[PDB]
Amino acid sequence: ATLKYICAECSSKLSLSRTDAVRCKDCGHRILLKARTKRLVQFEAR
């Protein structure tokens, strides 16, 4: 799916507004990752 955050511990998916900041709802963790973009980043082979 499209993504907004990842639980660090459970390594699943998630989405949140400016609501809670925590709680991998399953593990209830307190650290989330920012769910890598989709900008199709460009790279230079050198």
Partner 1 sequence: EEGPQVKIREASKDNVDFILSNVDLAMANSLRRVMIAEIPTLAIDSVEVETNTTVLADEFIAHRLGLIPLQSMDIEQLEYSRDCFCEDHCDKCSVVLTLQAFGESESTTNVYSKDLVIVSNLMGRNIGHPIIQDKEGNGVLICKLRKGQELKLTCVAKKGIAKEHAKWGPAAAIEFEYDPWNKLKHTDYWYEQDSAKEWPQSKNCEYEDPPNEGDPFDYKAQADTFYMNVESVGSIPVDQVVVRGIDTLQKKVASILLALTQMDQD
Partner 2 sequence: SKRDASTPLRSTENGIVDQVLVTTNQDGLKFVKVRVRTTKIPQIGDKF
Task: Summarize as ranges the residues that interact with partner 2 (CB under 8 A).
Answer: 5, 8, 21-22, 30-34, 41
Q: What does the alpha-carbon distance between residue 2 and residue 9 come to, in Å, rounded to a whole number? A: 19
Q: To 5 degrees, how large is the angle CA 29–CA 9–CA 36?
A: 100
Q: Which of Zn ion, partner 1, partner 2, none does residue 10 bind (CB under 5 to 8 Å by kind)?
A: Zn ion
CB of 39 to Zn ion, least distance (A): 24
Cβ of residue 30: shortest distance to Zn ion, in angstroms?
9
Residue written as token pair 């209830």? 28
Closer by beta carbon to partner 1, 11 or else 15: 11
Alpha carbon 18 to chain centroid, angstroms = 14
